[PDB]
Design a protein around this ligand. Sequence first.
Ligand SMILES: O=C1CC(=O)N([C@@H]2O[C@H](COP(=O)(O)O)[C@@H](O)[C@H]2O)C(=O)N1
Ligand SMILES: O=C1CC(=O)N([C@@H]2O[C@H](COP(=O)(O)O)[C@@H](O)[C@H]2O)C(=O)N1
Lengths: 218, 217
Amino acid sequence: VMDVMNRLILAMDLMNRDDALRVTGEVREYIDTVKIGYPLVLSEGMDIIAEFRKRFGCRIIADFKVADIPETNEKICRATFKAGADAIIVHGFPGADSVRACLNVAEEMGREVFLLTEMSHPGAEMFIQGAADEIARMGVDLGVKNYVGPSTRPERLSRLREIIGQDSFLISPGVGAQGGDPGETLRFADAFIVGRSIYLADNPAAAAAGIIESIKDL
Amino acid sequence: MDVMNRLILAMDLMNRDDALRVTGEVREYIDTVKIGYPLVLSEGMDIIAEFRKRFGCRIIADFKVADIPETNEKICRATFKAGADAIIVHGFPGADSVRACLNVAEEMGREVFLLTEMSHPGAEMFIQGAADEIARMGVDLGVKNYVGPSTRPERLSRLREIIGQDSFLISPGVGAQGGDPGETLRFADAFIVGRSIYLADNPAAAAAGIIESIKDL
Ligand SMILES: O=C1CC(=O)N([C@@H]2O[C@H](COP(=O)(O)O)[C@@H](O)[C@H]2O)C(=O)N1
Ligand SMILES: O=C1CC(=O)N([C@@H]2O[C@H](COP(=O)(O)O)[C@@H](O)[C@H]2O)C(=O)N1
C-alpha cells in the first residue's frame, strides 16, 4: 500500500493555480500525498497534475468520483492515468460493471483504484448509506484494495473497515471543516483527508503541523 | 429547451481534431451537443467555447456531478465559466448535493439535469431501486430537467409519469446500448446518441438514417 506521510492527505480544492501551488508548497514538508479533484482540474486543466509532480515530490490521487457507464468510465480512467495520476477515486453506487471497467484500466496501466463507499455529507443518508455495506462487499468481491469512507460517521467508518478487512487500504475525508476528528478517524482509516482546515488557514503549514501534532502518538 | 430533431450528440471522441471533424459532419442535423469527461479531460475545458464558436450549438456538460455540496458548487461554477449551458448531476448523493448545483445554475443562468436511473446493466444493483424516489426528490426540489434510460422503456415511462409532461426528459442508450430511437421518443423529449454516430464509417449518413426512422415524430 502507498506510504502516506503523517497519515495525512491534502484535499487541494483551491481553484486558482497560483494559490493551489503556493499552499501545497507550504505544507510540502508534512504531506507527500495530494488529492486533486475537479474543482482544480476543471479550472486549470489536467496539466495541473504534471505541474504538481514537477514541483513537489507528491503522490497524486485524482478524486474524480467516476460514476458513468463502463465504456465511459474506461475512457475517463485512461485519460486520468495518461496525465500522471497515481490513483483514481471511483463511485461504487453505479454497480459492479462500472467499477470493473475502472479496475481493468488501472490493472493494464499499472495504477490504483480507490472505491468510494459511503459519503461524509448529510445527503449521503438518503440513498448511499443504505447501499454502502453492499457496495463495500461488492468491492471486496471485485478485488478492490483501496477504499474511501466517511470520518463524519465513526460507526459507519468502523463497519466499512470490518467489511474490507485489515489488509485493505482506507482513506477518510470529513476531518476538520465537516466535523471529523483526526484521532478518532485513524482508529479505522489508514489516512485521513483534510482540505479547508488547511488550505483556508492563514498559515496552512501551521494548520497541518497542528493536526499532525494532535496525532503524534499514532 | 428546443433540441433540433430531438437528437443530442454524445461527443465522446477523445481527440480534438476528430471531435471537431465529426461534429462538423453532422452539424446540419443537430444544435445540441453533450460533452463529457472523455473529451474534456483529454483536450481541456476550452473545448466547450471552441464548439460554441464553431457550431453555436447548445452544450450540455455531462459531468455526472456526485460530490458533497461544497465541492459540487465549485464544479458547477468551473463548468459554467467554461460556457456550458447545462450540467448533468447524479441524484444518488442526496438532496443537498443537488441543491448546491441548482443554486449555481440559477446564479449563472443555466440548467441542471438530474440523472435518475442509468442505462447500463450495473444500474440494476443500486440505482434502479432508488430511481423513483430520486425522481420524486427532483420534483420536490423543483428540478425541471431529467435523464432516464432508453435501455429500459418501462423505467423511462415511469420516470416520465413521476415528473409530468411539463418536465424535460432526455435519454441515452440509443444505438450501441440497444435503445430504439422511436420507442425512446414515446417518453423522452430528446434522445442521446454517441457511438452509433461518431464511430460510424459515415457519421452524417448515420445521423441522417436515425432521423429518417423518426421522421413522423
Ligand atoms: O464522502 C466524501 C468523499 C470525498 O471525496 N470528499 C472530498 O474530500 C474533501 C473534503 O474537504 P474538506 O476537508 O471538507 O474541505 C473534498 O475534496 C471533498 O470533495 C468528501 O468531503 N466526502
Ligand atoms: O445512464 C446513462 C447516463 C449517461 O449520461 N450516459 C452517457 O451517454 C452517452 C451514451 O453514448 P453511446 O450512444 O452509448 O455511445 C455516453 O456519453 C454516456 O456516458 C449513458 O450512456 N447512460
